[PDB]
A = this chain, B = another copy of it.
Amino acid sequence: NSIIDLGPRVQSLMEQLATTKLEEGVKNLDMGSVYEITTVMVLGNSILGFHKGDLVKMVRPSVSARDLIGVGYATASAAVVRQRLIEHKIEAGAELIISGTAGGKTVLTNHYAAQMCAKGLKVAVVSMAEAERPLYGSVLHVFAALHLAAVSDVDVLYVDSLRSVYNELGGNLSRQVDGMLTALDQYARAVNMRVVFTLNPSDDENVDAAVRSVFKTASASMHTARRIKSFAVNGTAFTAETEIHLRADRSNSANRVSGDLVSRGAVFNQFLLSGQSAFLGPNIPESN
């Protein structure tokens, strides 16, 4: 039992979405058949629906997706059960590991992932919107990874990081940030998955002021809000002081955490050779 990296699976899915008319849909996919989940997300004014491993199709409704459905949700029939989450008494929902100038956001994610993997849980980690990682970390990349994990036999998913999503919703210039964090927790509950998100507002002017106000938001919207107060590396080993919030505890708690340093094109080429290249027409490409 080891941690599965969804990054390449998300990358190759983005390669397939770039080569076809999404209104017609991308059929004969193999995203996962373990759970019968349907992810519905907003891409600007368009809706992009991920059918449970069958298909991914886009719709352009007469009215904006922002008014109609907001951010995005997950629907499942008949049901979704994560037997191992019950076994290990791990509640479904979203967690936010947030750090400022102290850093150690990625280190702690790797620590908690390997720890969860050791306990017998099926752990998945997606790398995005950070240095040395190929995924740009867009809202589409988060929902693609979320769906890929949801429909598959994944119990705990680690999304590192939401840096691009935060910037995309103009978090560096917030209602939109709240709606996103609520939707991500709502999603994790509906899919009955434990999703652990990470964020460092390093693109923001006042990094630490953004950390406290985002942590206060995360505390209300998400199941767990974890703030890295301090972080120090000692060769292989690390140690970090953490502030943790669990809804609905009106009391916050300090939580020390230490351990060892745990470390983590065929589709497009095929298109280029065959002219199958205007599949948008009069509608401008949408972006969330």
Chain A interfacial positions (CB closer than 8 Å to B): 14, 17-25, 38, 40, 43-49, 51, 54-55, 57-71, 73, 75-77, 129-141, 163-164, 167, 172, 174-175, 178-179, 182-183, 185-186, 203, 220-221, 233, 247, 250, 265-266, 268-269, 271-273, 275, 277-288
In the complex, chain B residues whose CB is within 8 Å of the CB of A138: 66-68, 70
In the complex, chain B residues whose CB is within 8 Å of the CB of A47: 18
Inter-chain pairs besides A48-B63, A61-B285, A172-B175, 17 sampled, C-beta below 8 Å: A17-B62, A18-B59, A40-B265, A46-B63, A51-B269, A54-B273, A61-B279, A62-B286, A63-B286, A63-B287, A65-B285, A75-B265, A77-B265, A130-B182, A131-B178, A131-B182, A281-B282
Q: How far is the CB of A243 from chain B (nearest CB, A)?
A: 19
In the complex, chain B residues whose CB is within 8 Å of the CB of A141: 67
In the complex, chain B residues whose CB is within 8 Å of the CB of A60: 277-280, 285
User: Which one, B25, B178, B283, contacts A278 given CB within 8 A?
Assistant: B283
Q: How far does the alpha carbon of A272 sit from the alpha carbon of B22 in the complex, in Å?
A: 11
User: Which one, B17, B64, B203, contacts A178 given CB within 8 A?
Assistant: B203
> Which chain B residue has the least Cβ–Cβ distance from A130?
B182
Task: Indicate if the CB atoms of B287 and A67 lie closer than 8 Å.
Answer: yes
Q: How far does the alpha carbon of A18 sit from the alpha carbon of B179 in the complex, in Å?
A: 20
Task: Indicate if the CB atoms of A272 and B25 lie closer than 8 Å.
Answer: yes
> Which chain B residue has the least Cβ–Cβ distance from A267?
B75
Q: How far does the alpha carbon of A220 sit from the alpha carbon of B163 in the complex, in Å?
A: 15
Task: Indicate if the CB atoms of B179 and A59 lie closer than 8 Å.
Answer: no
Task: Indicate if the CB atoms of B268 and A40 lie closer than 8 Å.
Answer: yes
In the complex, chain B residues whose CB is within 8 Å of the CB of A19: 59, 61
Task: Indicate if the CB atoms of A175 and B164 lie closer than 8 Å.
Answer: yes
Task: Indicate if the CB atoms of A17 and B277 lie closer than 8 Å.
Answer: no
